[PDB]
Each structure stands twice: as structure tokens, then as C-alpha cells.
Design a protein around this nucleic acid. Structure first.
Length: 65
DNA sequence: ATGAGACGCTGGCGATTAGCTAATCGCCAGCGTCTCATCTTTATGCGCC
């Protein structure tokens, strides 16, 4: 197969919570997170853009993301 | 009741005196890197009005 679902497996291996990615209601948060991880590279900048989403994942998980 | 009108070696040299583009060819040309990201686009691989 040409197509695949790599981001889903990356998230499930990083955040270790399948329920968030499988949830349809979470897709806006997911698109914004992908947007942040794509638009930026600097750890401090990514960390600042995602301070609003630090309550859904552990700080160590916030580090890994 | 007299006193003007009629004007040269130059040309052919040397020998100063002064002055100017052009034709031929050769040489020789600032360059070195990295990072970072960014987009494209191509080779192959899959579908019928």
C-alpha cells in the first residue's frame, strides 16, 4: 500500500494514549499540535506554543512531544 | 601759363620637425566553505467517464 497512518503510530508511541488520537472530537487540537510541530523547530518556541496543552499530557510527555 | 603714368627665385630639393594607428598574439580572467529551513519537479509503482 502507498498510503499509511504513520502519525497515529508516532503519537501512540509518544503520548502512549490511543484514545486521544482515535477520538473524533480531538481533531482540532490534533491539527493544531501538528501545525505547531511543523511550523517550528526550536524547543523553546514549541514549548511556548504548547503551554496551553500541557494539562492533557505529563510534563515528561510534553518534553517528548 | 606742368610735371604723373610703367614695382622680386621659386620650385625643387633636403632636411628638419612633428606625430600616429594598426595588426598579432598572448593572458587571463575572485573563490572557499558550512548551517538552516523552504518549496517544487522527475524515474518507477494504482483508477474509465
Amino acid at each position: 500500500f502507498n498510503a499509511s497512518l504513520g502519525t497515529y503510530h508516532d503519537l501512540l508511541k509518544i503520548i502512549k494514549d490511543k484514545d486521544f488520537l482515535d477520538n473524533e472530537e480531538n481533531e482540532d487540537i490534533l491539527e493544531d499540535i501538528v501545525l505547531t510541530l511543523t511550523l517550528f523547530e526550536d524547543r523553546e518556541m514549541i514549548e511556548e506554543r504548547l503551554k496551553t496543552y500541557a494539562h492533557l499530557f505529563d510534563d515528561k510527555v510534553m518534553k517528548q512531544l
